[PDB]
Amino acid sequence: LRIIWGTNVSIQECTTNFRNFLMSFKYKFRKILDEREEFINNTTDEELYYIKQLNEMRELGTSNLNLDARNLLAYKQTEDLYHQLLNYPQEVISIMDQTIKDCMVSLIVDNNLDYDLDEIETKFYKVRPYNVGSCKGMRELNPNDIDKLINLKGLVLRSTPVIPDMKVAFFKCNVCDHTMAVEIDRGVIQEPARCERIDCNEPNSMSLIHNRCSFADKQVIKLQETPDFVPDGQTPHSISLCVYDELVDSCRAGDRIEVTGTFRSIPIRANSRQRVLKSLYKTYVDVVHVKKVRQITDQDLAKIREVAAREDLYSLLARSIAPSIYELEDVKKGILLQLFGGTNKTFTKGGRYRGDINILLCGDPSTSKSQILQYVHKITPRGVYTSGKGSSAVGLTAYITRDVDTKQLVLESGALVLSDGGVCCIDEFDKMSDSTRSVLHEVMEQQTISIAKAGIITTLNARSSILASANPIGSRYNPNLPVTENIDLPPPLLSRFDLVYLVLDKVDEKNDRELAKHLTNLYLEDVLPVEFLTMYISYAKEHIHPIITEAAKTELVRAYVGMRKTATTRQLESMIRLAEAHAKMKLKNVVELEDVQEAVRLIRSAIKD
Amino acid sequence: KVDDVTGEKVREAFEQFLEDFSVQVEKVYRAQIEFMKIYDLNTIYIDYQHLSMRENGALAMAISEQYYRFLPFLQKGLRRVVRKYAPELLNTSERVFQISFFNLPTVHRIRDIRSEKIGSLLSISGTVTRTSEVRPELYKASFTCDMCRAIVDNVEQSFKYTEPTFCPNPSCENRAFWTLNVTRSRFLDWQKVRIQENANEIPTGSMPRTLDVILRGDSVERAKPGDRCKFTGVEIVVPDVTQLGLPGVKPSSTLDTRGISKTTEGLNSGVTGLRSLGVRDLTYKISFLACHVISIGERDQEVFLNSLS
Amino acid sequence: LVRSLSPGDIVDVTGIFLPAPYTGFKALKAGLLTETYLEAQFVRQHKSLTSDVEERVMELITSGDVYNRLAKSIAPEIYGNLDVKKALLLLLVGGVDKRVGDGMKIRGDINVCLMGDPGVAKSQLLKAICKISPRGVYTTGKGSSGVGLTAAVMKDPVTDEMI
Ligand SMILES: Nc1ncnc2c1ncn2[C@@H]1O[C@H](COP(=O)(O)OP(=O)(O)OP(=O)(O)O)[C@@H](O)[C@H]1O
Ligand SMILES: Nc1ncnc2c1ncn2[C@@H]1O[C@H](COP(=O)(O)OP(=O)(O)O)[C@@H](O)[C@H]1O
Ligand SMILES: [Mg+2]
Ligand SMILES: [Zn+2]
Numbered sequence A: 001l002r003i004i005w006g007t008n009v010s011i012q013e014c015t016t017n018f019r020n021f022l023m024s025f026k027y028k029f030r031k032i033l034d035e036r037e038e039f040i041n042n043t044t045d046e047e048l049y050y051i052k053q054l055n056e057m058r059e060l061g062t063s064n065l066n067l068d069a070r071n072l073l074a075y076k077q078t079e080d081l082y083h084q085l086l087n088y089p090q091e092v093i094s095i096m097d098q099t100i101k102d103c104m105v106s107l108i109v110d111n112n113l114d115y116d117l118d119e120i121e122t123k124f125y126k127v128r129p130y131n132v133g134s135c136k137g138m139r140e141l142n143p144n145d146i147d148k149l150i151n152l153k154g155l156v157l158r159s160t161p162v163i164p165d166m167k168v169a170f171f172k173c174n175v176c177d178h179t180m181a182v183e184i185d186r187g188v189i190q191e192p193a194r195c196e197r198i199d200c201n202e203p204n205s206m207s208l209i210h211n212r213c214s215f216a217d218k219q220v221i222k223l224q225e226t227p228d229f230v231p232d233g234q235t236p237h238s239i240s241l242c243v244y245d246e247l248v249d250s251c252r253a254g255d256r257i258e259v260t261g262t263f264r265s266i267p268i269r270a271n272s273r274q275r276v277l278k279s280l281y282k283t284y285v286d287v288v289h290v291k292k293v294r295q296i297t298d299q300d301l302a303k304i305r306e307v308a309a310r311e312d313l314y315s316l317l318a319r320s321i322a323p324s325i326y327e328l329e330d331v332k333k334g335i336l337l338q339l340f341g342g343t344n345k346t347f348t349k350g351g352r353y354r355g356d357i358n359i360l361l362c363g364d365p366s367t368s369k370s371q372i373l374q375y376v377h378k379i380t381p382r383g384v385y386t387s388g389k390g391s392s393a394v395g396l397t398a399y400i401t402r403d404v405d406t407k408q409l410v411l412e413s414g415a416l417v418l419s420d421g422g423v424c425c426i427d428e429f430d431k432m433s434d435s436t437r438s439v440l441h442e443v444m445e446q447q448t449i450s451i452a453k454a455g456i457i458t459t460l461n462a463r464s465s466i467l468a469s470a471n472p473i474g475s476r477y478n479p480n481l482p483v484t485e486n487i488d489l490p491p492p493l494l495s496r497f498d499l500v501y502l503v504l505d506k507v508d509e510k511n512d513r514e515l516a517k518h519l520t521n522l523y524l525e526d527v528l529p530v531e532f533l534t535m536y537i538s539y540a541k542e543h544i545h546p547i548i549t550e551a552a553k554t555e556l557v558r559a560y561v562g563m564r565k566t567a568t569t570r571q572l573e574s575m576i577r578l579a580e581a582h583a584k585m586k587l588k589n590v591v592e593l594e595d596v597q598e599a600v601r602l603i604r605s606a607i608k609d
Numbered sequence B: 001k002v003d004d005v006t007g008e009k010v011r012e013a014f015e016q017f018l019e020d021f022s023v024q025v026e027k028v029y030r031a032q033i034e035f036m037k038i039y040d041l042n043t044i045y046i047d048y049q050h051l052s053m054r055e056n057g058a059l060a061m062a063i064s065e066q067y068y069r070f071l072p073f074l075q076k077g078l079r080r081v082v083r084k085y086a087p088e089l090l091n092t093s094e095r096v097f098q099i100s101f102f103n104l105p106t107v108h109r110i111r112d113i114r115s116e117k118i119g120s121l122l123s124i125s126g127t128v129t130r131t132s133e134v135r136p137e138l139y140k141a142s143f144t145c146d147m148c149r150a151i152v153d154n155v156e157q158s159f160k161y162t163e164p165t166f167c168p169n170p171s172c173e174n175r176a177f178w179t180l181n182v183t184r185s186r187f188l189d190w191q192k193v194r195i196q197e198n199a200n201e202i203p204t205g206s207m208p209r210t211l212d213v214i215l216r217g218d219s220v221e222r223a224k225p226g227d228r229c230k231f232t233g234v235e236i237v238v239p240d241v242t243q244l245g246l247p248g249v250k251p252s253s254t255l256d257t258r259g260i261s262k263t264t265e266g267l268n269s270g271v272t273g274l275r276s277l278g279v280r281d282l283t284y285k286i287s288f289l290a291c292h293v294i295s296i297g298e299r300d301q302e303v304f305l306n307s308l309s
Numbered sequence C: 001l002v003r004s005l006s007p008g009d010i011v012d013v014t015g016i017f018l019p020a021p022y023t024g025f026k027a028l029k030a031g032l033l034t035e036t037y038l039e040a041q042f043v044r045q046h047k048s049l050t051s052d053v054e055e056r057v058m059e060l061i062t063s064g065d066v067y068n069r070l071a072k073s074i075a076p077e078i079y080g081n082l083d084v085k086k087a088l089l090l091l092l093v094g095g096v097d098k099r100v101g102d103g104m105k106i107r108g109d110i111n112v113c114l115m116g117d118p119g120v121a122k123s124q125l126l127k128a129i130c131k132i133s134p135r136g137v138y139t140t141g142k143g144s145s146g147v148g149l150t151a152a153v154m155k156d157p158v159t160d161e162m163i
C-alpha cells in the first residue's frame, strides 16, 4: 500500500514476487527465456537451481549470492523488479536482504528439524548482483545516471589501507562518569546537550572516548581506462571505487577487473575552514560485486598414483614439458630432473647442505634456448623470468628504495628472493655486469643475501635454482677452441653450475630437412598432460623426502673412483643430487641402482660435450 | 558517580589470580613481586596460558575482548596486591607500573588488521624498518592557577595538551591561563617504530603494507631495524589532533609541504558536529600500541665463574 | 554540445567571451585583473563496408599492375630505389599471426631495416611511409625518449597523481 517517499518501490509486492521467483524458478524457465536453440533440457529443467544453492548455503552457513539480471528478467511477473532495481538500487537491495532474512526460515522448518536459527538470527545476509546491463567504459558516463547500477571495466592501479568509519559514538560525563551511546546519521554527530541523569544534570560536561566507539572497515581503489578502448592522442582517465565489508582486500594491484556498483556524486569544500562549497561535484562508484578479467581431492590422488605407475614416466614428461622443441631430449631430461631437486637437509653440526640443481645452456646463437626457458617458467609454481642484460646491480636482491606515494622507506625484495623454493630463469647471462655477478656468487654458495643500508642490517633467504642461457662471441661456437674463450664467463662461475649443456648446430641434410619439415607442419593448419605436471611437481616437492641406502654407496664410490682413473669433488655431490632427484620421480621413498645409473649417465653425457 | 559492576568482578578476579596461582605451591607471581622488590623493577609479566586455566577462560576472554576498558581495574587490583604483600614497591626513591602479556595462542599478520578488533589484545609479527628517538611523554600533568596560585595535579592527557578547566577550592573563576609545573609533572619514555610485512606473507606481486607501533616505558630500543620481531599489545585508533584545536599557533591549521591525495579527497569519511571541532571534520587511522616485544628473526675470571652452574 | 571537440583538431568555435571572477587566493595581488573564457555554442570542424568501396577494389583490380604501381606511387618525388618501395609495401601489409596451442606463438609483423650512406634520401622515405597508415609513430634519437617510455609515473598538473 504505502510507498517509500521519493521512489515508487513498495515492499509488499516485491517480497511476494521474490519468494515466488525463488521457489518457482528452475533452469526450465531460464532456457525458455534465452531459447537460443541447442538448449539442453536434460533433467536440468527440474533441478531447482535456486533452492539447491539455498540449502547448500544453509548447511555451509556462508552468505554469498550471485543473483543475475537476465535470470531476474526471466520470470514474467518479476520483470517489474528488473527495471525497478536499475533506478533504485539501495531500496531494492534493502528489500532483498529483508526477504533473505526469512528465506532461511522458509526452508529450515519444512521438515521441522532442530536447527538453532539463533546464529542465523544474529547473522545478516546480502546479495551481489552482476551483469546488470551492457558494459560501458568510464569515458561514457553522464550525470543522467547518478544513483543507478552500472557495470564498469578497468585496470587496478593501487589500493589504500583499511579506513575506519564511525558507527556508534560514545560519550562519557566527566562529573558523574555516565556512559551513553549516540548513533550517527550520514556522518554528522548530534551532540548530547546535557547529561541525561536528572541528578547530575550539568551543562557542558561531555567527553568523547575515541577508542570506545564502534568502527567499520572501508577501502578505496583506483582504476584506469583500458588501453584497448582509448582513441588516438588521448590520456587514460581514472575513477575511484568504494569497497566495504567482506569485499575489502580483494583486488590486487595491476589486475584488470569488471565491477558492478552504484554511481554517485558528492560535493567537496572550497575552503578548508569555511562552510563554503564549490559548484562542481566529484563522481565515484560504490561497488557491490567484483570479478576478474592445493587442496587436491582424493580422485586426484588416485589418478596421480596410477599415472605414477606408468612403465616409463621419464620419457613422457621428457616430451611433455617442451612439445614444440624437437630432439634436444637430453636437455629436457636434465630440466625434468632439475624441477624436482634432490632432498634438502640442515643438520645441526655440519649445517645446511644444498638441494638445488643449476643448469647453464650455451652454444650457437640461433638455437631455441629462450623458448625452453619460457616453457619451464610456466610449469614451476613460483618462479621469475627476467633477463640479465641490465637493470640494477642488486635487481635480483633487496634494494632499499624511497616510496613513491609516501615520503617513506620500503624494503623491496629482488628476483632471487622472490623465487625462493622454486626455479629462477636468467636470460642473456653473458651481458650481466661484473659488479652484480658477485651477488649471484653469494646466492649459489650460501643461499642467503645480506643488505646493510640506511640503518638496516639484515639477511634474506634465496634457496632457489638457477637455469641460465647464454650466447657466445661470434656467429658460431667452434669446437677447436675450448669453452672458456667463447662464453666470456669467469671459470668459477661456469664451474659452480651443476649441469652445463652445449647446443650445437651443424649443417646436416637429414637434420635440416627434419627440422624444416615439422616447422612447416606446425605452420600448416589441419600423450601431453596439461596441468598434471604442476600437481605432480607440488606433490613430489611438498610431501616426498627420499633417503640413501648402501646400494647407492657401492655404485657411487666406485663410479667416482672410476671417473678419477680431472673430476673434482663437486662431481660426486652433483651425482648425489641428481640421483636423489631421480628418486623423487617414479615416486619412491628411497634410492636404488636405477637412479644412480641414470645420474651418472647424465653427468657423463654432459662430460662428452 | 556511576560505577561499573563487571569491572569490579575483573578486578577481584585478577587479585585472586595473582594471589592464588602458585602452580609450578611456589607462588610464582609472588616470587616475581619479591624479585621486583629486591631488584627495583617497574614491570610485571603475566602469561596467557597460566590465566587460560582459571575460570575456564571466563576471565581470560573478558580481559582479551575489552583490554582497553579493563586495564584501569587490573592496575587498581595490582596496587592493592602490592600494598598487601610488598609496600616497598609502592613508592620510588609512586612507580607507574606496567603489565606485560605474552604467549598468546594465535598470531596475526599485518593484513588481518580490521577495525572490529580495536581495543582488543592481540599479537602481531613483522620486520622493523625504522626507529625514532626516545622522547619524553607527559603522563601526569601539574598546573598552577595564575591568580590564586592554587596547584592542580594528576590531570590526565589522552592525545593532546590538556589543561584543567574549573578552578580548585576557592571563589576564583578561571577557564584558562595555567602554567605547567614541568618539575612536578611525571614523564615516560616514548618511541615510534615502523614495521612491514614478512618476505613470505608478501604475495607474488605486492607493495608491502606498513603500520605504526608505539613502544612505551621499559620497552624502548628493544626493536632494532632490519630485525624480525613479534609484538603484542592493544589495537588503538589515533585521531588528527591538529584540527582538534591545539593551543599554539605553530600547527597553523594543517600546514603541508606535499600535496594530499585527490582520490581520497572527500572519500575519507570524517565526522562532524562536535563543538571542539567546530565546522571541521575529524579523521582517524589505525595504529598499534605494544606492551611486550620478542625477536623471532668480559675477560674477567671472577665474574665469569659466577654465571655458570 | 559536450564531447564535440577532441585533442588534435583544427576547428572554428563560436561562443560568448566572458570574464572569469579570479576570486579566492592570489586575487588580491591582481586587484582589477581578471581571467577570461569562452562559453561555446557552435562547432565547425574544418576537415566502412559499402557498395562504393566494394566497387573501388574491383576497379583497382581491373586497372592491373597493382604491385608495381602501388610500389611506385609511394613518394613519387624520389626517383629510384624501386625494390625498397616494393619492400615497404610488404611491410605495410602484415603476415599471419597464428596462435599455436600449448603456448607457442608466431609473429606476422615485418621488421625492415634500411642502411646506407648519408644523403641517399634516407629520411624522406620513412616520413612518407608514416602518411599511408594511420597507426604509426615517427620516433627519433635521444632528443626525446618515447621508444622505451613505458613509465608508470605521470606527474599530471591537474591532479598530481600517477597515471
Ligand atoms: N633518389 C633521390 N631522389 C630524389 N632526391 C634524392 C634522392 N637521393 C637523395 N635525394 C635528396 O636528398 C635529400 C633527402 O635526404 P637527406 O639528405 O635530407 O636526408 P638523409 O638521407 O636521411 O641524410 P642525413 O644523414 O644527412 O640526414 C633531398 O635533398 C633530396 O633531393
Ligand atoms: N629446435 C627448434 N624447434 C622449434 N623451433 C626452433 C628450433 N630452433 C629454432 N627455432 C625457431 O627459431 C626461433 C628461436 O628464437 P629464440 O631461441 O627465442 O632466440 P634466442 O636465440 O635469442 O634464444 C624461434 O622462433 C623458433 O621458432
Ligand atoms: Mg636525414
Ligand atoms: Zn553526568
Ligand SMILES: [Zn+2]
Pocket (backbone or CB within 6 Å): B145, B146, B147, B148, B149, B150, B167, B168, B172, B173, B174
Ligand atoms: Zn584560581
